[PDB]
């Protein structure tokens, strides 16, 4: 199925992986604690990123869920986060949400 | 551990410099 690639440069994910979390679809407007809005679409797995920082909680847009900034392991651009469950009784236990900005096709 | 925030997507950073670096790639 189709590659979502790194806008700036590598493909990230492909359409085969993208679920809805929430109910809110696969990708909707979620903001941040600044007001940037991040149009976050969901996927099970993603290739080629890179992890910045430790896991965290706060403002984290998928309730039970933690974020890890995830960046193109090829030119360094952020392209989202990696959430992991802090509790086992959740499914899935990981995924990854990317913002729509830095994948190419445009969706 | 990581005092120095990128506001835009929640990146921290140990080293000022690596802010920077970090903020410039968002343009
Ligand atoms: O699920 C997600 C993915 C991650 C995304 N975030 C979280 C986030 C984003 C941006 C900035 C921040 C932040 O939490 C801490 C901090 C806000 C509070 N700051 C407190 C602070 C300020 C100055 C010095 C030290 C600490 C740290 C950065 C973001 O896009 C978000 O809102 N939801
Ligand atoms: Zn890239
Ligand atoms: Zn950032």
């Not at chain 1, 199925?1 to 990230?12: G, N, V």
């Not at chain 1, 706060?58 to 392209?79: D, L, M, N, R």
Request: glycine share 6%; with cysteine.
């Amino acid at each position: 199925s189709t590659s979502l690639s790194c806008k700036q440069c590598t493909e990230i994910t492909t359409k085969n992986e993208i679920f809805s979390l929430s109910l809110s679809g696969p990708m909707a407007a979620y903001v941040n604690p600044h007001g940037y809005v991040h149009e976050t679409l969901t996927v099970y797995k993603a290739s080629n990123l890179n992890l910045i920082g430790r896991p965290s909680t706060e403002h984290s847009w998928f309730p039970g869920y933690a974020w890890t900034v995830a960046q193109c392991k090829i030119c360094a651009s952020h392209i989202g986060w990696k959430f992991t469950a802090t509790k086992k009784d959740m499914s899935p236990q990981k995924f990854w949400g990317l913002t729509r900005s830095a994948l190419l096709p445009t969706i | 551990e990581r005092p120095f925030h990128c506001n835009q997507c929640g990146a921290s950073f140990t080293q000022k410099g690596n802010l920077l670096r970090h903020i410039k790639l968002h343009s």
